[PDB]
Amino acid sequence: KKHSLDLLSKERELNGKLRHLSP
Amino acid sequence: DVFLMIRRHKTTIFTDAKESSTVFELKRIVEGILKRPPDEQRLYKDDQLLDDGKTLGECGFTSQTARPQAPATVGLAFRAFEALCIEPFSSPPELP
Amino acid sequence: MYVKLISSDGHEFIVKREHALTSGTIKAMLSGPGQFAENETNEVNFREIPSHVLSKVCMYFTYKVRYTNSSTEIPEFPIAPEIALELLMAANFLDC
Amino acid sequence: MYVKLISSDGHEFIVKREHALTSGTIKAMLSGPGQFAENETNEVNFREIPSHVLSKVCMYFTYKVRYTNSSTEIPEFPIAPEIALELLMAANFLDC
Amino acid sequence: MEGLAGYVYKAASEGKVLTLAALLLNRSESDIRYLLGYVSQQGGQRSTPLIIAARNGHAKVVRLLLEHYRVQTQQTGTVRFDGYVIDGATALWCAAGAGHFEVVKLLVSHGANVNHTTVTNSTPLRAACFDGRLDIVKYLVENNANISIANKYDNTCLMIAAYKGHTDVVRYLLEQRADPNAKAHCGATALHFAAEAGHIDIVKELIKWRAAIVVNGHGMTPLKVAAESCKADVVELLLSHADCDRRSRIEALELLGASFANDRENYDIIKTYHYLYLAMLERFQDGDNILEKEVLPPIHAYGNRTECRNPQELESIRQDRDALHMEGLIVRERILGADNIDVSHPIIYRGAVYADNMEFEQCIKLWLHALHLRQKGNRNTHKDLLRFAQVFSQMIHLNETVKAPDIECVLRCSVLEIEQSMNRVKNISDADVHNAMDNYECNLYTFLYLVCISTKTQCSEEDQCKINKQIYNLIHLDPRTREGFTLLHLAVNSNTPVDDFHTNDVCSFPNALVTKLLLDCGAEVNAVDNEGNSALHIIVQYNRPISDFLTLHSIIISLVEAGAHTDMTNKQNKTPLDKSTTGVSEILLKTQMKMSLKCLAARAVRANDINYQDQIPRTLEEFVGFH
Amino acid sequence: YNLIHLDPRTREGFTLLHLAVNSNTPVDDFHTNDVCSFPNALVTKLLLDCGAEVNAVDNEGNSALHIIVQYNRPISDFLTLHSIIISLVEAGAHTDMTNKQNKTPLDKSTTGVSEILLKTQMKMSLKCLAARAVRANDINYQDQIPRTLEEFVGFH
C-alpha cells in the first residue's frame, strides 16, 4: 500500500447523495 | 504465548504464536518462510501427526511446556508420505 | 524479515530479524556489504559454532526478546553443564 | 539551629532546624529579613495555628524526617477526627 | 403468544414451505393476526414475516400467507439494504427492492398499495427501478403507479434509473409521460443526474425527450459535471443538442481536458492535450470575434504561469507532463471556482503520485494548498489531516528538513477544526452523534501526531513559541474524549491508537516530548476522566517499563514537575501506586513523591466523612476531592 | 586524570570511584560537610570522564556498583543515586559481577529502589548467563576459553 492506493475519493457527498437516493 | 521449533531435515524455524491459536497460523508463517504449499507440509508432535484444525492450547502446546527457553520441537516433512527425518544436533563434548 | 543461521554442521536456524539483531556480530554481518535488501533469505554462515550451541543461541535470542522488560520472576535460562564453556565462547563471539 | 515554633496560645514548640525546614513557609519565615544569624532564638510566631494543631505539625515534622526514605510500609500518621480539617489548613499554610 | 411469532418469522425468512403450513396450522383468529405482524428486531432491522418473505423472494410462502391467512398488505417494516435504511415500507416495496416478480404480482393481486409511501415519501416504484427490472416496473405502472410524485428529497424513479446501469427501465419511464424537468433541493434536474452517471444511451435519449438544459442552484450546469467526471462521450451529444451555448461550448472539452489531466481513473496526457487543443481551436478561428480568456492572477503555490493565451505555449507543453497537468488544474480551479469541494482531490492525487517516488516538497505544497482550499470551504478535513501527518511522519523517517510554517498552519487549522467539532457535536443530533464523536477522536489523534511531528522538528524560537500559544488555546477550549480522556491522558497512554502508515515508525505513544510540550502550554495536569484516572494513573500502567524506561521515567517526573498529585484516588479509590501493575513505575512514583502532611490530612478528612464545605480554603476543597 | 592513572587505593581496597560513591566516606565536619555530600553524582561523573576504572574491586570484592546499591537514602536523594547508577552502567560496569562472597549488585542492594534502578539499567546477556553456569557447575575453564573470558568468568 502507498499514498495513492489508500487515497479514497470524497464519499461524504456520495453519502450525501445516497440519502436523497433512498428508494 | 507459545514458542515452538519447526524442524526440517536440517532447517530449523523458530516460531511464536498464541496459546489460543490453530495450526493454520503457523502453517501460514511457514508458508511465508519456506515457500512450500500447505497441503504437503504436516506437523509431528512427538512423532504423531496432528490435524490442521485444532488449537494448540489443547493439542499439547501449553505455555508451561513450550516456553521460549526450550521451545517444543515440532517435526515437519515435505512431499517429494515422507517419514519424520529430524536430524539431531551435534553431540556436545564431555566435561573436561 | 527472517535471518537464516547456518551452523558448523549445516543446520539452518531461520529466526526473526529483530530476534537475531540482539547480538552484536549478527548485526555487524547483516550490516556493511551484507545487507541483503530483499528479505527472503538474509543468510549468515557460521563455520565455527556447532549446531547444539547455535541452537541455544537462537533459543536465547527468543528468550531475551520475550522477557526483555519483565523484571519480575525472571525464569532461568537452562544451560546444560556440558554445553557451558562452549555457549560462553559463542556468546562472547556474538556480543550479547 | 534549634528553632522555636510558637502557637496561637503561647505554647512554645522548640524543634530542630532540619525538622522544621521540611515545611516551605517556615523556611520562608526563617529566610529573608528573619534570619538573624546569631543562633539565639530563631523564633517564629503562628498567630493562627492552635497549639493542639501545631503539636501535631511538629510530630509530623519528626515523623517525616524519620520515615522519608523508608518506603517499606511506614506506619500511618495518627490524625484524630477533630484534628483533621484544622490540621489541613495548617498543612496548607505550612506547605508540606 | 410471543414465542411462536419468532418461529413463524424464521420460517418465513428461510422460506421452508414444509414449515409454514405446520407452524401456522390450528391457530385462533386473534393469534393468526398477532403472529403475522409482530415486530422482530433482527440484525438491527424490524422484519415483519410478510416483508421478510417478500424480500427473500419466497413466492410460494407469500402466496400461501396471502391466500389462506389473509394478512393485511399495509404492514410496515425496516429492511437493511447495502447502505440504505428504509422504515415504514410495505411488502410490495420490499419485493420491488429485492426484484422478484412473483411476490410483486401476488401482493398487487391481493391488494397491495402501489401508492403507499415510506417516511421519506418513497414509493415501491423507486424500489422496483433501483435494480431496473422491466417486468416489475411494467406491472406496477399498469397497476396505477404515479411517476410525477417524487420522494421527500424530490427524487423520483427517473434519476434513480439514470444512475443505475439499467436502460430498459429508464426508457420505459421516458415512454410513459415522464417529466424530466423535476428539480432537487439544489435545483438538480434529471439531466444533472444522467450526466453525473454519464451513461451514453441515457443522455442520448434524454436529448430527444426535452433535456431542458438549465442552471441549478449552485450556478453549475449539467455539462460541467458531464465534463468533470472524466467522460469524453457525453459532451459531444450535449453539443449536438440544439440549445448549446457558445460559452458552455468554451467551457466544455476544456474543463474535460482539465479533469482528464489530473484524475486517478483517467490519467493520460495525449487525450488531455488533444481536448485542450481542440477547445482552444474552438475559439481561435474567428480573429475579429476572438474570445480572450479572463484568467485570475497566478498563485505562488500554483507555479508562476497564467494559463495559455497563445498556441506556442500550448505546443511547448506537449512534452511537459507536469506543466500540462498544472495548467489543467489551474483552469479547472478557474472554471469551477474556489468553492467546490471536489477541486481538492486532483491536487491530493498529484501530490500522492509525486510523493510515491521519494520526492516531497511539491507534494507538501500541493497538500498544504488543498488544506487551505478545504479550510475556506469549511469541510471535515480529518482524513486529509491524518494523511498529512502521515506524510510528515514519512518524510521525517526519510530524514528531510521540515517547514515549520507548515506545522504552524496545520496546527492552527487543527485547533479551529476541533472547535468546529465541539460546537457541531454540541448541536448534533443523536442519529450521527457516534460518527461525529469518532471523527472528533480522529482529529484528536491527528493533532497529537502533528504535535509529535513538531517535537521531532528543530523549529526556531518563534515557531515553537507560536505552536505553544496555539496548543495553549486548544487546551483552554478544553477538548475531552468521550471517555473523559483529555489531551494529556492520550499523550501519556500507550493505548492511544496509531494508524498503519509511517506514523508508527515516528509517532509512538506514550511520548516524553509530547507530554512535556503539553505541560508547557498550560495543560490541566490533574484532569480527571470518567473512570477517575488522571495522567499519572495512566502512565503508571505502562507495559514496557524497561526498554522504553527513560521515556516512562521522563513522563513521570514531568507530571511531578507540573503538579500532578501522586496521592489522587480514582473512582474506585485507587492511588496510582495501586494502579502501577509494575515494579518500575511503582518505585519511580515512590521516589517522585513527598510526605505531604496535606495528603495525610486530606485522607483523614475523606475517610472520616467530615463536611469540608466552606471551612477550608477554596483550593483545599478540590484538594480533598482528589483523595 | 593524572591521579586516576596513579591508581590510588585506601587500606580497605577502595579506589577513588568507590569512595566517591560510598555514603560512608568520612567528610570533614568543619565546613566541607555543608557542601561536600557523599555520594555525589558530579564527582563520579567527572572521575568516569577522566578515565576512572569502573570494575575495580575492594579487598571484599565490592565494585562501585556494589557500593552504590547499598545507599541508605534512595528516596530523599534519588537524583544522585540514579545519576551514579546511570554513569556507572554507561561507562561500562557488570551489573551481575560477584564479589568474594558471590553477591551480585542486585543481592547487595538493600533498598528495592536501587534494585529496580539497576534492573532497568541491567541488560540480559548470554555471556553472563553462560559464565554464571560455568561458575556454578565448576567446569574447568583453564585454557579452554580466551584470556578475556577467563577473567570474565572469574568475576561472574
mmCIF file of C-alpha atoms in Angstrom, chain F residues 8-82:
data_model
loop_
_atom_site.group_PDB
_atom_site.id
_atom_site.type_symbol
_atom_site.label_atom_id
_atom_site.label_comp_id
_atom_site.label_asym_id
_atom_site.label_seq_id
_atom_site.Cartn_x
_atom_site.Cartn_y
_atom_site.Cartn_z
ATOM 1 C CA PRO F 8 45.261 5.134 44.474
ATOM 2 C CA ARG F 9 43.832 2.654 46.959
ATOM 3 C CA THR F 10 42.839 3.012 50.607
ATOM 4 C CA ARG F 11 43.554 0.485 53.361
ATOM 5 C CA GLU F 12 40.391 -1.495 52.563
ATOM 6 C CA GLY F 13 40.892 -1.534 48.786
ATOM 7 C CA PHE F 14 38.658 1.433 47.959
ATOM 8 C CA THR F 15 39.658 3.253 44.787
ATOM 9 C CA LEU F 16 38.642 6.847 44.081
ATOM 10 C CA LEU F 17 35.367 5.724 42.490
ATOM 11 C CA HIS F 18 34.349 3.566 45.460
ATOM 12 C CA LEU F 19 34.972 6.455 47.853
ATOM 13 C CA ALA F 20 33.116 8.849 45.543
ATOM 14 C CA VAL F 21 30.056 6.561 45.563
ATOM 15 C CA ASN F 22 30.218 5.484 49.226
ATOM 16 C CA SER F 23 27.968 7.316 51.674
ATOM 17 C CA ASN F 24 30.324 6.172 54.461
ATOM 18 C CA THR F 25 33.241 8.231 53.129
ATOM 19 C CA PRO F 26 34.266 10.457 56.066
ATOM 20 C CA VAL F 27 33.660 14.065 55.063
ATOM 21 C CA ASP F 28 35.215 16.725 57.272
ATOM 22 C CA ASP F 29 32.757 18.257 59.727
ATOM 23 C CA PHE F 30 34.128 21.811 59.862
ATOM 24 C CA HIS F 31 32.856 23.343 56.608
ATOM 25 C CA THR F 32 33.070 20.614 53.943
ATOM 26 C CA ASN F 33 30.101 18.765 55.469
ATOM 27 C CA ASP F 34 27.793 21.592 54.342
ATOM 28 C CA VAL F 35 28.877 21.307 50.684
ATOM 29 C CA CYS F 36 30.696 18.021 50.054
ATOM 30 C CA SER F 37 27.982 15.356 50.350
ATOM 31 C CA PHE F 38 28.914 11.817 49.505
ATOM 32 C CA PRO F 39 27.832 10.018 47.384
ATOM 33 C CA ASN F 40 27.926 12.828 44.806
ATOM 34 C CA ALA F 41 26.882 12.452 41.178
ATOM 35 C CA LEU F 42 29.171 15.175 39.841
ATOM 36 C CA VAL F 43 32.442 13.847 41.275
ATOM 37 C CA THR F 44 31.706 10.339 39.983
ATOM 38 C CA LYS F 45 30.778 11.663 36.539
ATOM 39 C CA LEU F 46 33.986 13.722 36.454
ATOM 40 C CA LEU F 47 36.089 10.729 37.516
ATOM 41 C CA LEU F 48 34.497 8.481 34.886
ATOM 42 C CA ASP F 49 35.077 11.142 32.228
ATOM 43 C CA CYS F 50 38.684 11.259 33.481
ATOM 44 C CA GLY F 51 39.096 7.560 32.691
ATOM 45 C CA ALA F 52 38.386 6.109 36.124
ATOM 46 C CA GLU F 53 38.414 2.318 36.169
ATOM 47 C CA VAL F 54 34.853 1.196 36.842
ATOM 48 C CA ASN F 55 35.207 -2.520 37.615
ATOM 49 C CA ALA F 56 37.817 -2.097 40.355
ATOM 50 C CA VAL F 57 37.277 -4.175 43.489
ATOM 51 C CA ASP F 58 37.911 -3.822 47.212
ATOM 52 C CA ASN F 59 39.569 -6.368 49.472
ATOM 53 C CA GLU F 60 35.999 -7.659 49.875
ATOM 54 C CA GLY F 61 35.460 -7.649 46.104
ATOM 55 C CA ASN F 62 32.799 -4.927 46.018
ATOM 56 C CA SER F 63 32.913 -2.715 42.939
ATOM 57 C CA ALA F 64 31.495 0.803 42.663
ATOM 58 C CA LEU F 65 28.103 -0.713 41.848
ATOM 59 C CA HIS F 66 28.091 -2.958 44.931
ATOM 60 C CA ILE F 67 28.813 0.156 46.989
ATOM 61 C CA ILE F 68 26.202 2.446 45.436
ATOM 62 C CA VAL F 69 23.379 -0.119 45.538
ATOM 63 C CA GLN F 70 23.576 -0.169 49.360
ATOM 64 C CA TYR F 71 22.651 3.527 49.525
ATOM 65 C CA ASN F 72 20.507 4.322 52.562
ATOM 66 C CA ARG F 73 18.778 7.397 51.055
ATOM 67 C CA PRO F 74 17.185 6.359 47.742
ATOM 68 C CA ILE F 75 14.030 8.495 48.134
ATOM 69 C CA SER F 76 15.135 11.867 49.517
ATOM 70 C CA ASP F 77 18.307 11.770 47.389
ATOM 71 C CA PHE F 78 17.058 9.909 44.317
ATOM 72 C CA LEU F 79 18.749 12.145 41.737
ATOM 73 C CA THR F 80 22.255 11.365 42.999
ATOM 74 C CA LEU F 81 21.662 7.605 43.228
ATOM 75 C CA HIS F 82 20.054 7.474 39.783
#
